[PDB]
From Swiss-Prot, chain A:
Additional free-text comment from the UniProt record: Present with 94500 molecules/cell in log phase SD medium. There are 2 genes for eS28 in yeast.
GO cellular component terms, semicolon-separated: cytosol; cytosolic small ribosomal subunit
GO BP annotations, alphabetical order: maturation of SSU-rRNA; positive regulation of nuclear-transcribed mRNA catabolic process, deadenylation-dependent decay; ribosomal small subunit assembly; ribosomal subunit export from nucleus; translation
Gene3D superfamilies: Nucleic acid-binding proteins
InterPro entries (alphabetical): NA-bd_OB-fold (IPR012340), Ribosomal_eS28 (IPR000289), Ribosomal_eS28_CS (IPR028626)
Subcellular location: Cytoplasm
Function of the molecule: Component of the ribosome, a large ribonucleoprotein complex responsible for the synthesis of proteins in the cell. The small ribosomal subunit (SSU) binds messenger RNAs (mRNAs) and translates the encoded message by selecting cognate aminoacyl-transfer RNA (tRNA) molecules. The large subunit (LSU) contains the ribosomal catalytic site termed the peptidyl transferase center (PTC), which catalyzes the formation of peptide bonds, thereby polymerizing the amino acids delivered by tRNAs into a polypeptide chain.
Name of this chain's protein: Small ribosomal subunit protein eS28A
Keywords, ordered alphabetically: Acetylation, Cytoplasm, Ribonucleoprotein, Ribosomal protein
Cited HAMAP family: Ribosomal_eS28
Keyword Ribonucleoprotein: yes
UniProtKB/Swiss-Prot annotation, chain B:
Protein name: Small ribosomal subunit protein eS25A
Keyword Ribonucleoprotein: yes
One GO-annotated biological process of the protein: cytoplasmic translation
Compartment(s) of residence: Cytoplasm
Subunit structure and binding partners: Component of the small ribosomal subunit (SSU). Mature yeast ribosomes consist of a small (40S) and a large (60S) subunit. The 40S small subunit contains 1 molecule of ribosomal RNA (18S rRNA) and 33 different proteins (encoded by 57 genes). The large 60S subunit contains 3 rRNA molecules (25S, 5.8S and 5S rRNA) and 46 different proteins (encoded by 81 genes).
Extra remark: It is presumed that the precursor part of S25 is engaged in assembling of the small subunit, thus being essential in ribosome maturation.
Gene Ontology terms, MF aspect: structural constituent of ribosome
Main localization, broad class: cytoplasm
Family according to the record: Belongs to the eukaryotic ribosomal protein eS25 family.
Keywords, ordered alphabetically: Cytoplasm, Methylation, Ribonucleoprotein, Ribosomal protein
Residues of the full protein shown: 42 to 105 of 108
Highest rank taxon of the organism: Eukaryota
Any single GO CC term annotated in Swiss-Prot or TrEMBL for this entry: cytosol
Swiss-Prot record, chain D:
Function field: Component of the ribosome, a large ribonucleoprotein complex responsible for the synthesis of proteins in the cell. The small ribosomal subunit (SSU) binds messenger RNAs (mRNAs) and translates the encoded message by selecting cognate aminoacyl-transfer RNA (tRNA) molecules. The large subunit (LSU) contains the ribosomal catalytic site termed the peptidyl transferase center (PTC), which catalyzes the formation of peptide bonds, thereby polymerizing the amino acids delivered by tRNAs into a polypeptide chain.
Assembly description: Component of the small ribosomal subunit (SSU). Mature yeast ribosomes consist of a small (40S) and a large (60S) subunit. The 40S small subunit contains 1 molecule of ribosomal RNA (18S rRNA) and 33 different proteins (encoded by 57 genes). The large 60S subunit contains 3 rRNA molecules (25S, 5.8S and 5S rRNA) and 46 different proteins (encoded by 81 genes).
Family: Belongs to the universal ribosomal protein uS3 family.
Organism from which the protein derives: Saccharomyces cerevisiae (strain ATCC 204508 / S288c)
Protein name (database record): Small ribosomal subunit protein uS3
Residue(s) carrying Phosphothreonine: T41
Swiss-Prot record, chain F:
Function: Component of the ribosome, a large ribonucleoprotein complex responsible for the synthesis of proteins in the cell. The small ribosomal subunit (SSU) binds messenger RNAs (mRNAs) and translates the encoded message by selecting cognate aminoacyl-transfer RNA (tRNA) molecules. The large subunit (LSU) contains the ribosomal catalytic site termed the peptidyl transferase center (PTC), which catalyzes the formation of peptide bonds, thereby polymerizing the amino acids delivered by tRNAs into a polypeptide chain.
CDD domains attached to this UniProt entry: uS7_Eukaryote
Modified residues (Phosphothreonine): T8
PTM annotation: N-terminally acetylated by acetyltransferase NatA.
GO BP field: cytoplasmic translation; maturation of SSU-rRNA; regulation of translational fidelity; ribosomal small subunit assembly; ribosomal subunit export from nucleus; translation
GO molecular function, one term: rRNA binding
Protein name as catalogued: Small ribosomal subunit protein uS7
GO cellular component assignments: 90S preribosome; cytoplasm; cytosol; cytosolic small ribosomal subunit; ribosome
Length: 63, 64, 145, 56, 61, 206, 143, 141, 100
RNA sequence: UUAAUUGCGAUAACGAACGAGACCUUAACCUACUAAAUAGUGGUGCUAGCAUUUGCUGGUUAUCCACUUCUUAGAGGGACUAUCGGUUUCAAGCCGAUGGAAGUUUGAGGCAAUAACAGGUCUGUGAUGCCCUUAGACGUUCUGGGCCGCACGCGCGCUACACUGACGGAGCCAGCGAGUCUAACCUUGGCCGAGAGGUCUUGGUAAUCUUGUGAAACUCCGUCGUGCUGGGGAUAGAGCAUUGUAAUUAUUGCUCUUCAACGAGGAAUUCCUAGUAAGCGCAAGUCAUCAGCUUGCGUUGAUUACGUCCCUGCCCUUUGUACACAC
């Protein structure tokens, strides 16, 4: 079980056929020039904590 | 309660860091009724101390 | 402090009234297995016997079980009243009776034949295997045959 | 004699007795409505109609 | 569903065109002032109509 | 500890909770540490609750659910199975009962390690399914901060009563061993070997 | 000081009273104590069945205290409970009137209770004294 | 004219009449001490309005509370605020302002319901279901 | 003399008017008196199926109305009850005399 | 953008009407008014207890006095989305934090546009067009059965399938509503019987009496044990009572015995965004009697969103139509 971390700044919109999956812009603290979207199964909003397993591999709109 | 297990009970119950009715049943091959008398006898006898004797679960630990 | 170590008088199996009853359990709930004795009925015979209710079936001296047999044989002369017998006010003599495992099946079968020979409504329903209580078998009670 | 709740509803159905009976009998008389007033001893019933010369 | 209807909107703009210095930026002082110059025959209705005009004094500031 | 009594009999072992080192009514509350950065500001330990029985106005709004203490939220996730819907005082008694069961095995201040028992409970990543229709193509996503506190607290109880069906052991003695299990990453709890199967599709769907 | 039955625990009150009425059994012992279901809503007799008339006598003595007038219909309504009437759901039923009447007659035999004005039963002068006195000694038992 | 104030309190349907007066500081419910509340585990919770500010200033105030209506937790919720509301009333008659504000701040900082009544109230049930939003079980074919 | 008056009705305006008239006459002279005790109104509701048939979705309704009763008691000898015999009765409200 | 042609905006709209909205009721607050032994609070007198040394617990309408805080409704006040900061021609509108009883139209109901179904109804009328019967009448009345019935398939519901349990004890809290007169209701209390139940009386046309409906689910004590067992009461047998002119295919209740399936159930399907679901009980309805049903009421009281149009449907829209009592 490796370790990596980031966090969210602001929410944009939803994805998924049923509208449950949410992708939201995130940011990782050190070396603050780091910014990619990442989908989250649950609910997010501004100033939350992102958490994951791999380092950097984003996804996009779930059809 | 038999006799050959009486010696086992007295020499082995001050070795559980947690003692309870369910714990005695699982790891001693002792029924519920025989566990109730064992825990009430031990709490009255000495050593282990009744930190919380409550309804249906006598929460209990080891005292040395 | 109430603990008694085992001495050797405990027996696994018991043999009462031509029926098989298991031990290692409470005597108040031991006689309930035989046909014709329920939970409340077993409570009264045990209470009237004064045999230290909190006792296992296995640990029992042979001084008490046969007494339970004789008290339950004719309870009415022994102060258990008329409203504790299943066959209260019997249809043959009017006296009170309490059937046992060798009697609940014979008297019920005999009562079935009593109502059978008179061709009354309940007998033919019982003969057909149908409900005689007047319930609804349109949807309930279907997996019987 | 009778509970006020039962007295009032009995008044209401009695009130409904006049409404239909005045409507059914004095329909031609231009019947409009009935105002029922209760009073100790004597009581008065007020009727509304167009051809009042005929209702008398 | 806090969006107002037409009758409150049209009535609201009727006051300020001649009642600018009376529609004070406080709701409590003008929630009953409207009744004195606008004849409203409902306690419930007179509240939101006073509320809408009070809302515009906030933005018109 | 200002030992003053009033004209009603008050046993002074009750006035020691907050006019002292303000610890939970019978357990030390100050040494409570989070072992994961994922669930900061989402477990509402600090402030304390005397009994997790605040029937407050906490669930009407979207994100005011997590502002009650995790102890309070931990109560809620236990009354279900229909038979025990509602009847929350049935739970608050047992959680107050079982919290001393951690404070003996290398005491560790149970509330300190209650949070340590959430680091591996919540799924590290679950795989939401694309619309599709068929083989159910599930592409793996990371999870929200909330769903490692909000449904992970449902993962301590999603089937935790399957070890309480027609068996001798009571409810309160179970979570004690599973508590450190989520703290050490064990191989015999529920919430931490069903985190692993919840992400058996760990690094394949990217 | 100012101790009373109101200031003693309900479980403490019965256990202390259970000892007193079992250590002294002058009052009486009915003939059918061992065959009572205590209500039609019950299913099995109490498993104690050795005393169990002192436990009931203590509770009604407590019930008589902070209440003013209690008739036979008051106890059976309170002492009743739900019964599994077949597959039909639970329903509240009254308790046994005869046992309530017999225990009430027991309280009149000793003299702690008596017939009250406007019906019901009240607290006798001597009954109130003792109920307070035994309430005083049970507090220092745990002291 | 014995120093005395009166307050009240509701949680769901309980009306806890907090009769407050002056005395040696004896606190009881229905004439019974607070060592006997009901559930044996909310006993620490009903002590909350007393301990949050301490028993130091409770030695000269005594409150009578009589409660009726709702379930056991409902009355227990009624006593805590009624004696708390009665405490504010006593601070609203005799003791200085600076002391009063600190206790009131301590009451509300921990939780808001000690001085604010719960506005939640079961609304009437509706036809077409057992409750208001619950509905009968409907079937197709 | 314990003459007591009773006022029962459904609509509220008429019973309010007569009670104010009664208390105004009571206010005249001295007539040491008690104010109008307000009995708690009981809503008389009945649940009825709207449809006369059985076909259609389940639809119930509540048919209810309110009854307000207020009683006023007078305390002095027969001097007052020779002028209060005048009936200030409106449709709806009803009056009744009760003594002792 | 809003639950909403609900609003800003537009362009040839300028304006207006119904509905929604608006209106009313219920649940929320009023220590600001009116008051109340048919609701109460405190004190003063009489009476009992504890320790008595100070106080506490109670009872008392002809023992009075002061008040409406709690319980009542009467007129009213009160939230209107108010303040700031973010989004928007910076307009409607949305979001987060700052008073509170309340910032999902405060919550929910009542009323609830035009228009259609050849939707149900002739078993609701003494209003029914038409046909039929119309005197051994299909009209009325009287006796006995039927509407309950089983080789079978489905839908509403209740017990369930053990320990967050079963059983026996103690503490053990309300609301809606109902209740007799020339008829015989709500039944308090006393006595008898284990119980159902019976007898003698009491009060009530009702905030007063039933009723503080002292209800169950709830907690503290105990017995039990992982055992189709103490779970479970389907299956019957015998006896004891009530209702009714009459109860047999037991109305129903009570006592004893007999103690089967059920072991959390495979496609699909149902209701649900807060006191909501769910659990539990109560009152009312049908009643001479009988709730496993319905309506209302109260109690305990979760998890959890704060969104979407690929399904299940609808709304506006585009376009085609040899159709216009219109697939």
């Amino acid at each position: 079980t490796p370790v990596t971390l980031a966090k969210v700044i602001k929410v944009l919109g939803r994805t998924g056929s049923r509208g449950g999956v949410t992708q939201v812009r995130v940011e990782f603290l050190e070396d603050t020039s780091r910014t990619i979207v990442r989908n989250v199964k649950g609910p997010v909003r501004e100033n939350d904590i992102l958490v994951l397993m791999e380092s950097e591999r984003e996804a996009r709109r779930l059809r | 309660l038999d006799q050959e297990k009486y010696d086992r009970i007295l020499k082995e119950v001050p070795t559980y860091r947690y003692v309870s009715v369910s714990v005695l049943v699982d790891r001693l091959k002792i029924g519920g009724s025989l566990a109730r008398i064992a825990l009430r006898h031990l709490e009255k006898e000495g050593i282990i101390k009744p930190i919380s004797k409550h309804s249906k679960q006598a929460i209990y630990t080891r005292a040395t | 402090s109430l603990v008694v170590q085992e001495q050797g008088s405990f027996q696994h199996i018991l043999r009462l009234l031509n029926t098989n009853v298991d031990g290692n359990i409470k005597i108040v709930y031991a006689l309930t297995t035989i046909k014709g004795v329920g939970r409340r009925y077993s409570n009264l015979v045990c209470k009237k016997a004064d045999v230290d209710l909190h006792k296992r079936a296995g640990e029992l001296t042979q001084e008490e079980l046969e007494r339970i047999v004789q008290i339950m044989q004719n309870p009415t002369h022994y102060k258990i009243p008329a409203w504790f017998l299943n066959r209260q006010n019997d249809i043959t003599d009017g006296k009170d009776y309490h059937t046992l495992a060798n009697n609940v099946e014979s008297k019920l079968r005999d009562d079935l034949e009593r109502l059978k020979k008179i061709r009354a409504h309940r007998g033919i329903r019982h003969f057909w295997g149908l409900r005689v209580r007047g319930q609804h078998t349109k949807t309930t009670g279907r997996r019987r045959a | 004699l009778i509970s006020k709740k039962r007295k009032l509803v009995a008044d209401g159905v009695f009130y409904a007795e006049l409404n239909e009976f005045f409507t059914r009998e004095l329909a031609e008389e231009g019947y409009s409505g009935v105002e029922v007033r209760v009073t100790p001893t004597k009581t008065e019933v007020i009727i509304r109609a167009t051809r009042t010369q005929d209702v008398l | 569903g806090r969006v107002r209807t037409k009758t409150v909107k049209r009535a609201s703009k009727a006051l300020i065109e001649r009642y600018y210095p009376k529609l004070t930026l406080d709701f409590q002082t003008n929630k009953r002032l409207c009744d004195e110059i606008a004849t409203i025959q409902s306690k419930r209705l007179r509240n939101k109509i006073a509320g809408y005009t009070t809302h515009l004094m906030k933005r018109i500031q | 500890f200002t030992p003053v009594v009033l004209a009603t009999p008050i046993p002074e072992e009750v006035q020691q909770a907050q006019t002292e080192i303000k610890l939970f009514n019978k357990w030390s509350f100050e040494e409570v540490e989070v072992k994961d950065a994922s669930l900061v500001d989402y477990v509402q330990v600090r402030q304390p609750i005397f009994v997790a029985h605040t029937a407050g106005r906490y669930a009407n709004k979207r994100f005011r659910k997590a502002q009650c203490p995790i102890i309070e939220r931990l109560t809620n996730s236990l009354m279900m199975n229909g038979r025990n819907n509602g009847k929350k005082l049935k739970a608050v008694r047992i959680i107050k009962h079982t919290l001393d069961i951690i404070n003996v095995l290398t005491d560790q201040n149970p509330i300190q390690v209650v949070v340590d028992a959430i680091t591996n409970t919540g799924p590290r990543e679950d795989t939401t399914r694309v619309g599709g229709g068929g083989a159910a193509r599930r592409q793996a996503v990371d999870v929200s901060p909330l769903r490692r506190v909000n449904q992970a607290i449902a993962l301590l109880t999603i089937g935790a009563r399957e070890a309480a069906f027609r068996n001798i052991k009571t409810i309160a003695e179970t979570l004690a061993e599973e508590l450190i299990n989520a703290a050490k990453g064990s191989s015999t709890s529920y919430a931490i070997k069903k985190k692993d199967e919840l992400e058996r599709v760990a690094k394949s769907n990217r | 000081p100012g101790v009373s039955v109101r200031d003693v625990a309900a479980q403490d009150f019965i256990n202390a009273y259970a000892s007193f009425l079992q250590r002294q059994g002058k009052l009486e012992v009915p003939g059918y104590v061992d065959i009572v279901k205590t209500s039609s809503g019950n299913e099995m007799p109490p498993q104690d069945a050795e005393g169990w008339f002192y436990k009931r006598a203590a509770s009604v003595a407590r019930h008589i205290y902070m209440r003013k007038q209690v008739g036979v219909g008051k106890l059976n309504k309170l002492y009743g409970g739900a019964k599994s009437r077949g597959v039909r759901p639970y329903k509240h039923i009254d308790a046994s009137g005869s046992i309530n009447r017999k225990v009430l007659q027991a309280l009149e035999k000793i003299g702690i209770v008596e017939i009250s004005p406007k019906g019901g039963r009240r607290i006798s002068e001597n009954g109130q004294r003792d109920l307070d006195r035994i309430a005083a000694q049970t507090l220092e038992e745990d002291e | 004219a014995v120093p005395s104030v009166q307050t009240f309190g509701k949680k769901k349907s309980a009306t806890a009449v907090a009769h407050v007066k002056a005395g040696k500081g004896l606190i009881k419910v229905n004439g019974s001490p607070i060592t006997l509340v009901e559930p044996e585990i909310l006993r620490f919770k009903v002590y909350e309005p007393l301990l949050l500010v301490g028993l130091d200033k409770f030695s000269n105030i005594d409150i009578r509370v009589r409660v009726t209506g709702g379930g056991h937790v409902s009355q227990v919720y009624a006593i805590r605020q009624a004696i708390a509301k009665g405490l504010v009333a006593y601070h609203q008659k005799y003791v200085d302002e600076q002391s009063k504000n600190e206790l009131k701040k301590a009451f509300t900082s921990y939780d808001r319901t000690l001085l604010i009544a719960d506005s939640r109230r079961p609304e009437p049930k509706k036809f077409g279901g057992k409750g208001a939003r619950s509905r009968f079980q409907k079937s197709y074919r | 003399i314990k003459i007591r008056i009773t006022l029962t009705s459904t609509k509220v305006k008429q019973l309010e008017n007569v009670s104010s008239n009664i208390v105004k006459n009571a206010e005249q002279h001295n007539l040491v008196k008690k104010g109008p005790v307000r009995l708690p109104t009981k809503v008389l509701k009945i649940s009825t199926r709207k449809t006369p048939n059985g076909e259609g979705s389940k639809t119930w309704e509540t048919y209810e109305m309110r009854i307000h009763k207020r009683y006023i008691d007078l305390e002095a000898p027969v001097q007052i009850v020779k002028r209060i015999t005048q009936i200030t009765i409106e449709p709806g409200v009803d009056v009744e005399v009760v003594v002792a």
